[PDB]
Curated annotation (Swiss-Prot):
Keywords: Cytoplasm, DNA-binding, Sigma factor, Transcription, Transcription regulation
Name of this protein: RNA polymerase sigma factor RpoD
Domain notes: Contains 4 domains, connected by flexible linkers. In the active conformation, the domains are in an extended conformation, each making extensive interactions with the RNA polymerase catalytic core. In the autoinhibited state, sigma-70 factor domain-1 packs closely together with sigma-70 factor domains-2 and -4, contrary to the extended conformation that is seen when the protein is part of the RNA polymerase holoenzyme.
Sigma-70 factor domain-2, as annotated region: 238-305
GO-annotated biological processes: DNA-templated transcription initiation; negative regulation of DNA-templated transcription; regulation of DNA-templated transcription initiation; response to heat
Amino acid sequence: MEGEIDIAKRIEDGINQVQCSVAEYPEAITYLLEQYNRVEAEEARLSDLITGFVDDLAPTATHVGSELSQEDLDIDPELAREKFAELRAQYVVTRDTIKAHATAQEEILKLSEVFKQFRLVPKQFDYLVNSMRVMMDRVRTQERLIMKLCVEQCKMPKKNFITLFTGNETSDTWFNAAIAMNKPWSEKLHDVSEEVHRALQKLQQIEEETGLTIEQVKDINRRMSIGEAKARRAKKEMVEANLRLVISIAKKYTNRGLQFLDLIQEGNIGLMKAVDKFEYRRGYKFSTYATWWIRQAITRSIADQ
């Protein structure tokens, strides 16, 4: 046995970070209760929604940092009825204190601790995690646009733009002040007014959709990325540390119908799946765990040609 437990524990930590970031996203919460309002009206199956409940357990968001393509990547009825009830009751209470910061924040930190009890099934965490990235892409589209209009089209140098937008980033309050600074690039910004207003009004929509501020959506996302990058990096090291293994097994299916470099492509896809599904807590030797996956991808592939 090896420090493959140490990469393993690093993979796990990065994946928890992503899960904790999902738990900070309001839309992840609603969607979870919306998907249960699909299980009880039977449009969906609970085993495709969550795995079980936590009261450390291994992460269920197994797809984070995986190098396999998204195409290769694809509960007692009453306890489940109880928990989803506990989520729904705690939600509608937070949904109110949002209207009525230290006390509200301690409940916001609790709706998130209740959400984290749900061991969502991989594909679902994938919906959430992508859901969030696409939203961060909208924030990013509008902010880059705005800087191009101000900094490039109207000639406001970078320095001043940073200074103004970098605050709240949503109300006109920051823009009309650029105009009101009456410097050479100020009146010019009138040729950029409506396009710049619509962005801010589109940026405000993101905040309304998400139920966060632009700075928060960015926050959670930045934190998610640190997690995604830690797991990704760590899985890459697990796959790279086991290419000896892959070559070893492939050398066993040598003149069996599939040529070498293809034999280690299928071997490697078996390894990347192994690196994903593996759990160190279970006490088994990775080397052995990987072998069933590596081999299966190799034999399986030999059967198709």
